[PDB]
Write a protein that binds this ligand. Structure first.
Ligand SMILES: [Ca+2]
Length: 245
């Protein structure tokens, strides 16, 4: 009858301008309103933001637009002993403080099959890419950079320099097998294939909460409730929330 909250990002982290605050509970939350009320987010410079649930256990908070670099965020999850519905009570409080770093937005345009990395509005890197085949396309939309792996076995394929950008399993990563197609032809299951050198560059130069935007593919749009797809939910839907849904 107790539920523990877990907050991301980590205390003292510097994250990108797309990073939502995430409060994840280890049990389903029946009274989302109570949970939201128990979570106090302070921003400096102050910016309006709102809660939206990605699933029964995890709520996100973010502003209407990407964060401003330098913004400091304090999160107080004051859930200890709070009634969260159906006889479940918050086990404890948790807190985090984090800050926003540089604006890093990488745009993959299916028209050019180039991923262009912009840091604070400035092009710093361009890399040929091979995106999802027509039958398995990469969805368009805004993706948030999540975890990274120097090496990972995808699921069985060994992969180097893998930067995760969706929970659905889209990564930017080393793809030595499609170097010839990069910049020319889509060959993947959905991942953004780039050269070993470019994948290592990307891995080294991004951080959690940086943004990848995919445009002009034959896919649809990445689901807002993917896990890293938050920004695809239009603000008016996000702000309205789903506490009573
Ligand atoms: Ca109850």
């Amino acid at each position: 009858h107790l539920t523990m909250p877990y907050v991301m990002p980590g205390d003292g982290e510097v994250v990108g301008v797309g990073e939502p605050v995430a409060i994840r509970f280890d049990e389903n939350i029946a009274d989302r309103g109570a949970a939201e009320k128990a979570i106090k987010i302070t921003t400096n410079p102050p910016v309006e933001g709102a809660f939206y649930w990605l699933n029964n256990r995890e709520v996100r908070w973010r502003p209407e637009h990407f964060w401003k670099p330098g913004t400091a965020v304090d999160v107080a999850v004051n859930t200890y002993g709070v009634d969260l519905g159906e006889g479940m009570f918050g086990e404890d409080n948790v807190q985090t403080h984090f800050t926003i770093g540089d604006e890093v937005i990488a745009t993959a345009d299916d028209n050019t099959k180039i991923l262009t990395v912009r840091v604070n509005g400035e092009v710093v890197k361009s890399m040929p890419t091979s995106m999802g085949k027509d039958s398995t396309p990469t969805a368009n939309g805004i993706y948030i950079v999540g975890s990274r792996y120097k090496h990972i076995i995808m699921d069985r394929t060994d992969v180097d320099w893998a930067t995760q950008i969706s929970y659905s399993g889209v990564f930017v990563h080393s793809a030595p097998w499609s170097v010839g197609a990069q910049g020319h032809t889509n060959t993947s299951h959905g991942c953004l294939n780039v050269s070993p050198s470019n994948a290592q560059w990307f891995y080294d130069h991004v951080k959690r909460g940086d943004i990848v935007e995919v445009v002009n593919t034959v896919g649809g749009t990445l689901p807002g409730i993917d896990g890293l797809g938050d920004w695809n939910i239009p603000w008016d839907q996000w702000r309205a929330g789903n506490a009573k849904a």
